[PDB]
Amino acid sequence: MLSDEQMQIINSLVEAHHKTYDDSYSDFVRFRPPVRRLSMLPHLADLVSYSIQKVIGFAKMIPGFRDLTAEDQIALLKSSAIEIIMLRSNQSFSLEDMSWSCGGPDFKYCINDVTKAGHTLELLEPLVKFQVGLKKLKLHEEEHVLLMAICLLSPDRPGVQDHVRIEALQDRLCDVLQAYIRIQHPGGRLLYAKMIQKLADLRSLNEEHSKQYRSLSFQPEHSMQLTPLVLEVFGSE
Amino acid sequence: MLSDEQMQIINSLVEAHHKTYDDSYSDFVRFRPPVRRLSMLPHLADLVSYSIQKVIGFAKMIPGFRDLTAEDQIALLKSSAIEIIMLRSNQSFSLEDMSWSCGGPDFKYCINDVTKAGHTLELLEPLVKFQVGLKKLKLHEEEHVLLMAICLLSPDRPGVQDHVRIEALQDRLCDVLQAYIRIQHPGGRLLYAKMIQKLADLRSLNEEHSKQYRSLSFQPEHSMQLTPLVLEVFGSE
Amino acid sequence: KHKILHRLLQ
Amino acid sequence: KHKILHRLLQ
Ligand SMILES: CC1[C@H](O)CC(=C/C=C2\CCC[C@@]3(C)[C@H]2CCCC[C@H]3[C@H](C)CCCC(C)(C)O)C[C@H]1O
Ligand SMILES: CC1[C@H](O)CC(=C/C=C2\CCC[C@@]3(C)[C@H]2CCCC[C@H]3[C@H](C)CCCC(C)(C)O)C[C@H]1O
């Protein structure tokens, strides 16, 4: 049996996700349209920028994240943003297509769309693979949400200062996830391990993205196409 | 009778305008769509950003602008960009509507559209008035192009260094314009004066815009919506 | 340093 | 200082 405050953490985390996840993908009509040079860079730059603001809204509602000093909140967001975006994007990923179906027909990004945004297959191979791995875990909503919160509250990120306080939070998060799986997820004897390995894979994707982004942002004809928030979060300042 | 090199300057300037003015306004479908908060800020930010790249392409083809040191070319563009955009936008302005008709129906910006982009009527009044003034001058293509080149080559802008070299160019430009009007524009006895007064009005619009932009860019929820080139050109660096 | 993030984080 | 303008100006 799960605890009362353990249940409170799941309830507040699920709600945070519902407030920051638009199941209708309707704000996508407000981005710069897809094209198919780097034809898909503008639309996917706007996608990432949009998603960063959702990830900040989610983080602001994680219990206790708000109580960290503003520096630490920046250091965690600056380094985990891309990982939480890869994490939440599983919701729109489909094993049936091997693409991300975000509502309408023009907002379905398969693998060839994403190469036209300036990224090579040495990022997209590990990325698509990661998504079918995470999709095969058939995670409950409660687990998908907890995994994002635990990826955010990692002390071992560049620039964090209160390693101890952030570590408390993250451990409080994995107690809940271990209890939840063990008590509410039949056949999850190995699932929590499979999820921690997913965080490991995410770190590897972060590196690959950070390398390919560095190349994309040192040529101004491309960084031009990026948004100010994307430049800020992925900038090295 | 106009001179040979005078005619060469008009020919090369008209061509520069044709290479950097899309009479089909077709790249407007590639901007963030209009909405009607600051609903029109994204689309009009993308409009200005687009136009800045056209103004740079035009400048790069003004005879002798290319031969200025890279600093001076930046100082002229950073201060005159908005004036050349107000100047070229006369082409899409219509006395019949009092709006800017840029091809399709959603790219027709009347005065209420432009207030939803974070600007007050103390900029839009002098702006719309300016446009019907410039529109009533029925300028030849040759004159409209020369006026942009003369607004660009003004030495009295912040940060210019070779005041003498830039002043040579600008005077070479007004000799052509005075000769052209006097020789090819029937009933232009007063027209060149009316055009120099238009440059004066442009300086006043520049100030008003620079004041309202400063307010818009000190609040990050709005500067966020701007593009990197717009931040750079209108930034104070 | 980080103008936008500071805003978004209230 | 002015990364984009330098590019656009070749
Ligand atoms: C809610 C909403 C929906 O579920 C759909 C989502 C999908 C997210 C995806 C799949 C498509 C590819 C990108 C966008 C990827 C998420 C980030 C990794 C790769 C992406 C690409 C290469 C960006 C390059 C831009 C940059 C310059 C920053 O490198 C985002 C999610 O927030
Ligand atoms: C080729 C093409 C076409 O002819 C149409 C053109 C029209 C230009 C106009 C009319 C509509 C209003 C704006 C966009 C104005 C030109 C610039 C002054 C006011 C504009 C607005 C307030 C921007 C605020 C954005 C900022 C944050 C920079 O302040 C641009 C021209 O390049």
Q: What is the DSSP string of A5-68?
A: HHHHHHHHHHHHHHHH--TT-GGGGGSPPP----TTHHHHHHHHHHHHHHHHHHHTTSTTGGGS
Q: Which residues, in sequence order, are CB contacts of A148 under 8 Å at separation 6+? A: A17, A58, A84, A87, A88
The CA distances from residue B50 to B28, B32, B107, B113, in Å, are 9, 12, 14, 18
Q: Please choose from A22, A43, A56, A89 the residue to mutate so as to test ligand 1's pocket, defined by most ligand atoms within 8 A of CB.
A: A89
A228 in contact with D, Cβ within 8 Å: no
**CA–CA separation, A208 and A123 (whole Å):** 6
Method for this entry? X-ray
CB-facing half-sphere around the CA of A224: CA atoms within 13 A:
20
- Reported resolution in A? 2.9
Nearest CA distance, D2 vs chain B (angstrom): 6
Rounded Cα distance between B144 and B166, Å, is 20
Please work out whether the CB of residue A128 comes within 6 Å of at least one atom of ligand 1: no
Q: Is B17 marked within a binding site?
A: no
Instruction: Check if A217 has its Cβ closer than 6 Å to any atom of ligand 1.
Output: no
Say yes or no: CB of residue A184 within 6 Å of ligand 1: no
Residues 6+ apart with CB under 8 A from B164: B155
Q: How far is CA B159 from the centre of its chain?
A: 19
Shortest Cα–Cα distance, A129 to chain D (Å): 36
Residue pair B52/B230 in contact (Cβ under 8 Å)? The answer is: yes
The answer, for A223 touching chain D at a CB cutoff of 8 Å, is yes
> Six-digit token pair at A96?
């049936």
What Å distances lie between residue A205 and A110, A198, A237, B63, B142, CA to CA?
18, 10, 21, 50, 56
Interchain proximity B56–D1, CB inside 8 Å: no
Residue A94 backbone dihedrals phi, psi, to 5 degrees: -135, 125
Please name the residue of chain D whose CA is at the shortest distance from the CA of residue A222. D4
Q: B119 among the known binding-site residues?
A: yes
User: Up-side HSE of residue A185: CA atoms within 13 Å toward CB?
Assistant: 20
CA distance A181 to A184: 5
Angle between helices A191-217 and A141-152 (to 10 degrees): 50
Helical segments of B89-190, H only: 111-115, 121-136, 141-152, 163-184
Residue with tokens 């860019």, as numbered in its chain: B217
Interface test with A, best of B26, B32, B219 (most A CBs within 10 A): B32
C with D: touching (≥3 Cβ pairs within 8 Å) = no
Other Cβ atoms less than 10 A from the Cβ of A36: the count is 11
CB-based contact A233:A77 (threshold 8 Å):
yes
Strand B93-94 to strand B99-101: parallel, antiparallel, or no bridges (unpaired)?
antiparallel
For residue B233, the chain D residues in CB contact (below 8 A) are 5
Indicate the Cα dihedral angle B22, B27, B29, B35, nearest 10°: -70
Strands (E), chain B: 93-94, 99-101, 108-109
Pair of tokens at residue B82: 């908005």
| Residue at A64: amino acid letter | G
